[PDB]
Structure formats: C-alpha cells, structure tokens
Design a protein around this ligand. Sequence first.
Ligand SMILES: CS(=O)(=O)[C@@H]1CCCN(c2ncnc3[nH]c4cc(F)ccc4c23)C1
Length: 167
Amino acid sequence: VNSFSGYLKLTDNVYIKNADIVEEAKKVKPTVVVNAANVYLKHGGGVAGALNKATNNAMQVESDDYIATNGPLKVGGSCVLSGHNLAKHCLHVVGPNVNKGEDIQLLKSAYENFNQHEVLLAPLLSAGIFGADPIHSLRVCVDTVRTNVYLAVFDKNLYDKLVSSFL
Ligand SMILES: CS(=O)(=O)[C@@H]1CCCN(c2ncnc3[nH]c4cc(F)ccc4c23)C1
C-alpha cells in the first residue's frame, strides 16, 4: 500500500492522474520524482522548469555542479540527484526531444531507467515541449516500465484523450 490517491489504473503496474507533478510531489513526497531533463540539466521550462522553480533553484545549483564534474548525460540516459523539498530523490531522465531531431526510438531506452526504482512519480517522457506524441509515450511506458509508475498529466484535455484512447 502506498500514499498515491485518485489514480486510474491502466495496467498491473501503471497508474495515471490529471495532476500537477509539482503539487503531487509536494503532497506525496515520493521516494522518486522523475524530471523531464535535457542532457545539460538546464531546467528552463516544461516539467523541469516547474520542478526547479518549486525548489527555489536548488535543483539547478545541484545540477550545475553535477555537469561540471561529469559532463552531459546521454539522450536516453539518467542520473539520480536530490529530490530537495519535493521527493527523496529526483531521477533526471532525458527523453528524445523531437524539436531537436532526436531519434524517437531512444524513448524506450529513456523509460528503461524507471526499472531501477520500485515506485516512481513521473511525467510522460518526451511529451510537452519535447515534441513527441503523448499517446505514443504512454504506450512505450506501459510496454517498457515494469516497476510501479504513477503518471501525472498536467493538461486535463490530454489526460482524457490518453485514457479514452488507451488500448
Ligand atoms: C516536455 S513536458 O515536461 O513539458 C510534458 C508536456 C506537457 C506538460 N508536462 C507536465 N506533465 C506533468 N506535470 C506537469 N506540471 C507542469 C508544470 C509546468 F509549468 C509545465 C509543465 C508541467 C507538467 C509534460
């Protein structure tokens, strides 16, 4: 039993809710919140900008030190950093950004990072300003992630479309 509330169950292990991931993280304080990161961990907008803003820029300060030491992530890769005031940990995952021409097949590799964590609060990878089709992202999530994932979808309209079209 966990503390996530109001989710619709899509499969054995995937759940979905119309929610603001920042507010959801602030209430649940999950072990892991997933960030929709880029390879430079520059959290300027979308989910990343909102998560970082909620940490009063502490996420960005920590991220800049990580990059200075380790260099950029790979598209499809991830790193575990602090969750600050939002979660115990933040799993920064880089889905492909269609608006940069990155290969959509890397979306499966990106979701594989979730399997290293038993339970996660997450957005749909490569959705929003990353330019991929969110219905496709949900399909890849369901077909790739085997651990327990609670998906927060900010836009109520998109949420309804994702549920109604789910196979
Ligand atoms: C590539 S993206 O991350 O922008 C993708 C596109 C749609 C919006 N995104 C979110 N999904 C879940 N919760 C969210 N809170 C947010 C707060 C914001 F100020 C902006 C986006 C989100 C958000 C997912």
